[PDB]
Design a binder for this molecule. Structure first.
Ligand code: FD2
Ligand code: CA
Length: 223
């Protein structure tokens, strides 16, 4: 997260860290046994780490659970990043409590202007690479589709929305992918992509979760 702030230990209880000997992506706990992330984060041998703050130190409250199966959206396109959503089933159910909780799926799409909270352990620098130990947060509004499409001509699908600041300096970045975009207590987006990080007129593009509610529910119900 570039231009964000230290969230505070366990203040984002639904935030998940996807680990394979190091943190490579974020995710959101949607129920005791299912995590939603980005399809481009797909990797075998994934360990889901819940209740994390400092990812390098064991401080207590952590829960390391292996993924039993990662279901990448069947229509995910790795070039366009369209349908960039993946469901991960936990080998065991997470122990939900004050520091490890699930986030609700939206019942309707969020409108432009809506302020959301984006979080993750991704790169904190626009020019260079600097990864934080603790979770970083960023509050950012959902942009209008006209502005979004103006920023990324021919790259925005109906399953994507822009959120961030056109002036640059504040945005999600590498390592944040798969992470949550929560608006009014609902998971509206998944950190997907962007041209660089915190660049002027190049906001972050996120997977529009409200377009996937039925798919998520149906897939979970059949798995
Ligand atoms: C297929 O999955 C990948 O290989 C991933 C590589 C990383 N990736 C990116 O968008 C990167 C870094 C990144 C990641 C997440 C959010 C932002 C942001 N600015 N909000 C930037 N930004 S980038 O400018 O280097 C970039 C942008 C668009 C891309 C589209 C397809 C493939 C790689 C891409 C890389 C997403 C796709
Ligand atoms: Ca830790």
């Amino acid at each position: 997260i570039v231009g964000g702030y230290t969230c505070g230990a366990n203040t984002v209880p639904y935030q998940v860290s996807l680990n394979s000997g190091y943190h490579f992506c974020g995710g959101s706990l949607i129920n005791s046994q299912w995590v939603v992330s980005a399809a481009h984060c797909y990797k075998s041998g994934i360990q889901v780490r819940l209740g994390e703050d400092n990812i390098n130190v064991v401080e207590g409250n952590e829960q390391f659970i292996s993924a039993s199966k990662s279901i990448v959206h069947p229509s995910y396109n790795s070039n366009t990043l369209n349908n960039d959503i993946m469901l991960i089933k936990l080998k065991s159910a997470a122990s939900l409590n004050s520091r490890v909780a699930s986030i609700s799926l939206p019942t309707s799409c969020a409108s432009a202007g809506t302020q959301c909270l984006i979080s993750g352990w991704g790169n904190t620098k626009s020019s260079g690479t600097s990864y934080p130990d603790v979770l970083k947060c960023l509050k950012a509004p959902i942009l209008s589709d006209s502005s979004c499409k103006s920023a990324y001509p021919g790259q925005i699908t109906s399953n994507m929305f822009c959120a961030g600041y056109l002036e640059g300096g504040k945005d999600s970045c590498q390592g944040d992918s798969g992470g949550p975009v929560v608006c009014s207590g609902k998971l509206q987006g998944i950190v997907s992509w962007g041209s660089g990080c915190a660049q002027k007129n190049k906001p972050g593009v996120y997977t529009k979760v409200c377009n996937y509610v039925s798919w998520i529910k149906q897939t979970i119900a059949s798995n």
